[PDB]
């Protein structure tokens, strides 16, 4: 009943709301979606059935999408190119701002390498990739500020700004590496791994308040709670790979985990209360207060405005 399902024609890989001003008591209404597994993929912007406002033909596949600010959307293509789009609200038109065509490319060989994940702290854009590379750019710089080459032989899947000038990266062999952007060396400060297992890690998230709490997800569908200072807790959850984990921004006591089996579970800390919000595969989710949106591989967008009712 809560969820209103509008069927689109493109598999939805990413769903992210437009950051809302805290001072004003406004409710988030505009969110953005990115599509994959199609000949001509695209980036759409919707307003809460959701009505699409504007969309742009995105070259390649939209792997990861982050909202830099209210008017800028940073998208990572599957060809490695990291692009920034400027939203002109007055004319409802998305326009290309700045792009780094060869941000990620495999060593020596010809052809391209995919950009798995991006993270943003205006004006710093750190992008990891399948190749061992942690390229760092700036909103107005036409050049790459720093490139940690051969950082990880294995494909890196995700990235997040632990503290400042520090990034936590997960890789295909099950290793959480703490990196530092000030040290000029190309070696990780610390490497956290489960003893004996090499289960790949797909997702990583940091607690909004305390910076020492990091939650990650593996191919075994297990939620591992880590303490970067001191895995504290291993939680059995899904019976299949956990693609994305997200903490609720306003009230962190709530957590949402999406798996390919098709279950948008909700964890409530405030005895963890686990409930199935949805009745193919759920790829992404984004929550901001009482509003949540998730995109599935069944070419559908599920939007709720009364999540906690």
């Amino acid at each position: 009943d809560k969820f209103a399902a509008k069927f689109v024609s493109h598999k939805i890989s990413r769903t992210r709301w437009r950051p809302v001003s805290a001072s004003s008591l406004q409710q988030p209404d505009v969110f953005a979606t990115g599509s994959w597994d199609n000949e001509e993929n695209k980036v759409c912007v919707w307003a809460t059935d959701p009505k699409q406002l504007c969309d742009i033909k995105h070259p390649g596949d939209v792997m990861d999408m982050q909202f830099l600010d209210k008017e800028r959307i940073v998208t990572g293509s599957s060809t490695g190119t990291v692009t920034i789009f400027r939203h002109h609200e007055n004319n409802q038109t998305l326009s290309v701002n700045q792009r780094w065509e060869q941000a990620h490319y495999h060593v020596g060989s010809n052809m391209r390498a995919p950009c798995t994940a991006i993270v943003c702290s205006s004006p710093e854009i750190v992008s990891v990739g399948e190749d061992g590379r942690i390229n760092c750019f700036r909103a107005e710089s036409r050049d790459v500020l720093r490139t940690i080459d051969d950082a990880d032989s294995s494909t890196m899947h995700g990235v997040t700004f632990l503290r400042t000038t520090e990034i936590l990266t997960v890789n295909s062999v099950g290793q959480l590496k703490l990196w530092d952007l000030r040290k000029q060396g190309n070696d990780p400060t610390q490497i956290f791994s489960v003893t004996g297992e090499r289960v790949p890690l797909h997702c990583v998230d940091r607690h909004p308040n305390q910076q020492h709490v990091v939650a990650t997800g593996g191919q075994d569908g297990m939620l591992c709670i880590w303490d970067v200072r001191h895995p504290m807790s291993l939680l059995n959850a899904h019976e299949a790979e956990m693609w994305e984990v997200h903490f609720h921004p306003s009230n962190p006591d709530h957590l949402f985990t999406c798996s390919e089996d098709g279950s948008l579970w909700h964890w409530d800390a405030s005895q963890l209360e686990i409930t199935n919000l949805l009745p193919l595969s759920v790829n992404s989710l984004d929550v901001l207060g009482q509003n949540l949106v998730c995109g599935t591989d069944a070419e559908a967008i599920y939007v709720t405005r009364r999540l906690f009712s």
Partner: peptide, 10 residues
């Protein structure tokens, strides 16, 4: 802000 978030919170 930074001291509160990183040192004090820790």
């Amino acid at each position: 802000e930074v001291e509160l978030n990183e040192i004090e919170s820790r």
